[PDB]
Amino acid sequence: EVVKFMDVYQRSYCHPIETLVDIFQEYPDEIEYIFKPSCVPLMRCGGCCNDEGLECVPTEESNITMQIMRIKPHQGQHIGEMSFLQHNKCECRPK
Amino acid sequence: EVVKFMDVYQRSYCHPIETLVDIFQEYPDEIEYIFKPSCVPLMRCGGCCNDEGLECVPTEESNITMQIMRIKPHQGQHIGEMSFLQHNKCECRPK
């Protein structure tokens, strides 16, 4: 009934993790519009390093393309491809 | 090659997701400590709702206990059990 240390440590250590990101967080210049869904799941470096002087950063990145809806008031519905940055590999590196 | 709309929509929609959380955020009376790991994986509501008028909020919670290494000044390294809140169910509700 208690998670063991090594299992928490390994599961929490710097690695790509599925992260739900708001499309505005990625693209603040798009904040005038409405997206559906308004957030997307993206692999992004997450977790912690052995020392608060290291940071978890990507060492391999790629684009992923997703079908998203975008609309404006009193307008037609658009559906189109939208690309986002994902993190494929992460390592702990000096800040 | 392209993630299809309904897949993106279902995967992004409000639900419990594994989230990496800093322990200090959960134990604010213990910011004098250094923890190892310094963050833990927790199930927490995430993702988006259908409207800017709704928020994704927990509607069912429970605890999980993990073994965490802890040190503070005038102390050596200890290992101890720390409990964290998890989210078991999430719903979209008006802000």
Partner: peptide, 14 residues
């Protein structure tokens, strides 16, 4: 036990 690499248990005993 390099600080930049994921650690095994031995590391946490050093």
């Amino acid at each position: 036990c390099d600080i930049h690499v994921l650690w095994e248990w031995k590391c946490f005993e050093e």
